[PDB]
Design an enzyme around this catalytic site. Structure first.
Site, PDB file in Angstrom:
ATOM      1  N   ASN A   1     -18.061 -16.519 -12.428  1.00  0.00           N
ATOM      2  CA  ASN A   1     -19.231 -16.505 -13.298  1.00  0.00           C
ATOM      3  C   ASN A   1     -19.201 -17.648 -14.305  1.00  0.00           C
ATOM      4  O   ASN A   1     -18.132 -18.075 -14.759  1.00  0.00           O
ATOM      5  CB  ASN A   1     -19.331 -15.168 -14.042  1.00  0.00           C
ATOM      6  CG  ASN A   1     -18.524 -15.152 -15.320  1.00  0.00           C
ATOM      7  OD1 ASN A   1     -19.012 -15.553 -16.379  1.00  0.00           O
ATOM      8  ND2 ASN A   1     -17.277 -14.695 -15.232  1.00  0.00           N
TER       9      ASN A   1
ATOM     10  N   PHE B   1     -22.182 -16.958 -22.320  1.00  0.00           N
ATOM     11  CA  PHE B   1     -22.483 -16.135 -23.494  1.00  0.00           C
ATOM     12  C   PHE B   1     -23.987 -15.894 -23.657  1.00  0.00           C
ATOM     13  O   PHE B   1     -24.543 -16.151 -24.724  1.00  0.00           O
ATOM     14  CB  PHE B   1     -21.968 -16.790 -24.788  1.00  0.00           C
ATOM     15  CG  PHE B   1     -20.480 -16.652 -25.016  1.00  0.00           C
ATOM     16  CD1 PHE B   1     -19.829 -17.505 -25.899  1.00  0.00           C
ATOM     17  CD2 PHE B   1     -19.741 -15.669 -24.375  1.00  0.00           C
ATOM     18  CE1 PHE B   1     -18.463 -17.380 -26.144  1.00  0.00           C
ATOM     19  CE2 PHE B   1     -18.372 -15.537 -24.612  1.00  0.00           C
ATOM     20  CZ  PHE B   1     -17.737 -16.393 -25.497  1.00  0.00           C
TER      21      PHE B   1
ATOM     22  N   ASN C   1     -16.479 -20.928 -20.276  1.00  0.00           N
ATOM     23  CA  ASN C   1     -17.869 -21.323 -20.063  1.00  0.00           C
ATOM     24  C   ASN C   1     -18.603 -21.770 -21.324  1.00  0.00           C
ATOM     25  O   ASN C   1     -19.825 -21.924 -21.318  1.00  0.00           O
ATOM     26  CB  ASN C   1     -18.631 -20.174 -19.401  1.00  0.00           C
ATOM     27  CG  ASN C   1     -18.038 -19.791 -18.062  1.00  0.00           C
ATOM     28  OD1 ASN C   1     -17.656 -20.658 -17.276  1.00  0.00           O
ATOM     29  ND2 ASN C   1     -17.948 -18.493 -17.798  1.00  0.00           N
TER      30      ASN C   1
ATOM     31  N   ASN D   1      -8.506 -13.260 -20.015  1.00  0.00           N
ATOM     32  CA  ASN D   1      -9.851 -13.627 -19.575  1.00  0.00           C
ATOM     33  C   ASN D   1      -9.788 -14.150 -18.132  1.00  0.00           C
ATOM     34  O   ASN D   1      -8.748 -14.063 -17.475  1.00  0.00           O
ATOM     35  CB  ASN D   1     -10.412 -14.714 -20.499  1.00  0.00           C
ATOM     36  CG  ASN D   1     -11.917 -14.604 -20.691  1.00  0.00           C
ATOM     37  OD1 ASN D   1     -12.678 -14.519 -19.725  1.00  0.00           O
ATOM     38  ND2 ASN D   1     -12.352 -14.603 -21.948  1.00  0.00           N
TER      39      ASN D   1
HETATM   40  C1  LIG Z   1     -19.629 -11.511 -14.963  1.00  0.00           C
HETATM   41  C2  LIG Z   1     -18.498 -11.516 -15.993  1.00  0.00           C
HETATM   42  C3  LIG Z   1     -18.805 -11.699 -17.338  1.00  0.00           C
HETATM   43  C4  LIG Z   1     -17.794 -11.716 -18.293  1.00  0.00           C
HETATM   44  N1  LIG Z   1     -18.117 -11.823 -19.652  1.00  0.00           N
HETATM   45  C5  LIG Z   1     -17.115 -11.775 -20.632  1.00  0.00           C
HETATM   46  C6  LIG Z   1     -17.439 -11.868 -21.981  1.00  0.00           C
HETATM   47  O1  LIG Z   1     -18.615 -11.970 -22.331  1.00  0.00           O
HETATM   48  N2  LIG Z   1     -16.429 -11.824 -22.951  1.00  0.00           N
HETATM   49  C7  LIG Z   1     -15.088 -11.686 -22.571  1.00  0.00           C
HETATM   50  O2  LIG Z   1     -14.201 -11.628 -23.421  1.00  0.00           O
HETATM   51  N3  LIG Z   1     -14.768 -11.596 -21.210  1.00  0.00           N
HETATM   52  C8  LIG Z   1     -15.783 -11.641 -20.245  1.00  0.00           C
HETATM   53  N4  LIG Z   1     -15.455 -11.555 -18.886  1.00  0.00           N
HETATM   54  C9  LIG Z   1     -14.028 -11.425 -18.508  1.00  0.00           C
HETATM   55  C10 LIG Z   1     -13.607  -9.973 -18.270  1.00  0.00           C
HETATM   56  O3  LIG Z   1     -13.707  -9.244 -19.496  1.00  0.00           O
HETATM   57  C11 LIG Z   1     -12.168  -9.877 -17.754  1.00  0.00           C
HETATM   58  O4  LIG Z   1     -11.285 -10.424 -18.738  1.00  0.00           O
HETATM   59  C12 LIG Z   1     -11.975 -10.633 -16.437  1.00  0.00           C
HETATM   60  O5  LIG Z   1     -13.124 -10.472 -15.601  1.00  0.00           O
HETATM   61  C13 LIG Z   1     -10.727 -10.143 -15.699  1.00  0.00           C
HETATM   62  O6  LIG Z   1     -10.847  -8.760 -15.349  1.00  0.00           O
HETATM   63  P1  LIG Z   1     -11.371  -8.316 -13.891  1.00  0.00           P
HETATM   64  O7  LIG Z   1     -10.666  -9.033 -12.804  1.00  0.00           O
HETATM   65  O8  LIG Z   1     -11.161  -6.723 -13.819  1.00  0.00           O
HETATM   66  O9  LIG Z   1     -12.961  -8.563 -13.878  1.00  0.00           O
HETATM   67  C14 LIG Z   1     -16.463 -11.563 -17.908  1.00  0.00           C
HETATM   68  C15 LIG Z   1     -16.160 -11.380 -16.560  1.00  0.00           C
HETATM   69  C16 LIG Z   1     -17.170 -11.350 -15.603  1.00  0.00           C
HETATM   70  C17 LIG Z   1     -16.803 -11.080 -14.142  1.00  0.00           C
HETATM   71  O1  LIG Z   2     -15.284 -14.673 -22.103  1.00  0.00           O
HETATM   72  C1  LIG Z   2     -15.949 -14.933 -21.102  1.00  0.00           C
HETATM   73  C2  LIG Z   2     -17.409 -15.372 -21.254  1.00  0.00           C
HETATM   74  C3  LIG Z   2     -18.211 -15.100 -19.980  1.00  0.00           C
HETATM   75  C4  LIG Z   2     -19.543 -15.853 -20.047  1.00  0.00           C
HETATM   76  O2  LIG Z   2     -19.687 -16.828 -19.278  1.00  0.00           O
HETATM   77  O3  LIG Z   2     -20.382 -15.438 -20.874  1.00  0.00           O
HETATM   78  N1  LIG Z   2     -17.443 -15.519 -18.797  1.00  0.00           N
HETATM   79  C5  LIG Z   2     -16.099 -15.142 -18.679  1.00  0.00           C
HETATM   80  O4  LIG Z   2     -15.561 -15.100 -17.573  1.00  0.00           O
HETATM   81  N2  LIG Z   2     -15.362 -14.844 -19.833  1.00  0.00           N
END
Ligand SMILES: Cc1cc2nc3c(=O)[nH]c(=O)nc-3n(C[C@H](O)[C@H](O)[C@H](O)COP(=O)(O)O)c2cc1C
Ligand SMILES: O=C1C[C@@H](C(=O)O)NC(=O)N1
Ligand SMILES: CCC(=O)Nc1ccc(N(C)Cc2cccnc2)cc1C(=O)O
Ligand SMILES: CCCCCCCCCCC[N+](C)(C)[O-]
Length: 359
Positions: free
Chosen positions: A109, A113, A181, A248
């Protein structure tokens, strides 16, 4: 049924962002069945000044704007983290900005934000503030993850604003300096920049009235150098940071990825991230002498995945990407498998297993 039929059928119809939006809507409306699995005392964890009825939370990014919190507790999560939230509303990157790698059980992704902003989320949380107070007392805490606007000329001030506005509504706050990102954001993980940023964040937090004073955690990347990790551990101990979230998404692309979309720009999540995250947990736990609570995140899709992060040093875990492949049933599955494994490996409960590998 979800893993074999519904999810595969859904993913074949909707692009991942549309599917995500629909999932948030369905969850917020409470359309899903109330999870059958009842949490046993074995799964209870006490950390960060709160009780968690089970150690499995929904990671940031799924509910970015705080729209589906109650639906997520209904799904069986022991705690919910919303965000990242930025001070002002912003749209994020142009579409497409989310990609499935089904052959890898991974997602990439680059949302950037997209956020309704602090004011909108503030009022959304205020509308259910007392309901949350009861949930928290009941062992179901709420975390709020803070980000920075794309065009902000003072990063520390953005986070400070977030502490002031949403800190009073959160059981814990997350200073997210690890999104891949937003340009320049990850450099805030550097020692000097991090110390300055976190000193300001903690001062703002300390200025809140006691009953509205959240724990503060820092969420870090899986892609840090050894020097980076040493410096973060040093700063966390110097300033008394309450905890870490590890990790992350990764900007790396591990050898072996099969998905056609593997070379899309963005953060990689899911199974290819799992052990990179676990090893980062292991290192940060050792560097902080096990004295700093860690929420372990990255590639958790089973009880074994959860227990490996717990044994590596996590007090709590989160998942997101597994949900997008296996659907809501994965939450109960992880908890049921975790309980069984704890019993099999001689642990009286989750608490006994935290950091067990280091002993
Ligand atoms: C679509 C998407 C959006 C994410 N948005 C955020 C975010 O806004 N803030 C944040 O701290 N992590 C964000 N993450 C990271 C997740 O919180 C997590 O740290 C990461 O995906 C690893 O866990 P997973 O493999 O179970 O998804 C995002 C991940 C994905 C897949
Ligand atoms: O903390 C984040 C931000 C998020 C985004 O693109 O908004 N994407 C991520 O994978 N981690
Ligand atoms: C990576 C972007 C993202 O969030 N994706 C998803 C999130 C949820 C679901 N569900 C349909 C699971 C679900 C169903 C109903 C309620 N809650 C969750 C599916 C996806 C998907 O990409 O196919
Ligand atoms: C409305 C102010 C600008 C930001 C809009 C954010 C739209 C968020 C839509 C749901 C979450 N999702 C990640 C699936 O886009």
């Amino acid at each position: 049924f979800y893993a074999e039929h519904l999810m595969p059928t859904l993913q074949g119809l909707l692009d991942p962002e549309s599917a995500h939006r629909l999932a948030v809507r369905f969850t917020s409306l409470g359309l899903l069945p109330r999870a059958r699995f009842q949490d046993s005392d074995m799964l209870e964890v006490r950390v960060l000044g709160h009780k968690f009825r089970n150690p499995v939370g929904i990671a940031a990014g799924f509910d970015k704007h705080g729209e589906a919190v109650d639906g997520l507790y209904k799904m069986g999560f022991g705690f919910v983290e919303i965000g990242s939230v930025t001070p002002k509303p912003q749209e994020g990157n142009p579409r497409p900005r989310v990609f499935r790698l089904p052959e890898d059980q991974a997602v990439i992704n680059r949302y950037g934000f997209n956020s309704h902003g602090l004011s909108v989320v503030e009022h959304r949380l205020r509308a259910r503030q007392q309901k949350q107070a009861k949930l928290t007392e009941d062992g179901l805490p709420l975390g709020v993850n803070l980000g920075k606007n794309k065009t902000s000329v003072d990063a520390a001030e953005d986070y400070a604003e977030g502490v002031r506005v949403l800190g009073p509504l959160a059981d814990y706050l997350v200073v997210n300096v690890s999104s891949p990102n937003t340009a320049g954001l990850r450099s805030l993980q550097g020692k000097a920049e991090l110390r300055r940023l976190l000193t300001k964040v903690l001062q703002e937090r300390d200025g809140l009235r006691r009953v509205h004073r959240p724990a503060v955690l820092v969420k870090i990347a899986p892609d840090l150098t050894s020097q980076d990790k040493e410096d973060i551990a040093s700063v966390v101990k110097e300033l008394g940071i309450d905890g870490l979230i590890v990790t992350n998404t990764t900007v790396s692309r591990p050898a072996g990825l099969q998905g056609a979309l593997r070379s899309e720009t963005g953060g990689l999540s899911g199974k290819p991230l799992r052990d990179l995250s676990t090893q980062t947990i292991r290192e940060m736990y050792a560097l902080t002498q096990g004295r700093v609570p860690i929420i372990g995140v990255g590639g958790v899709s089973s009880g074994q995945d959860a227990l490996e992060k717990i044994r590596a040093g996590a007090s709590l875990v989160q998942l997101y990407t597994a949900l997008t492949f296996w659907g809501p049933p994965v939450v109960g599955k992880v908890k049921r498998e975790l309980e069984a494994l704890l019993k099999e490996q001689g642990f009286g409960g989750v608490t006994d297993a935290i950091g067990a590998d280091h002993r």
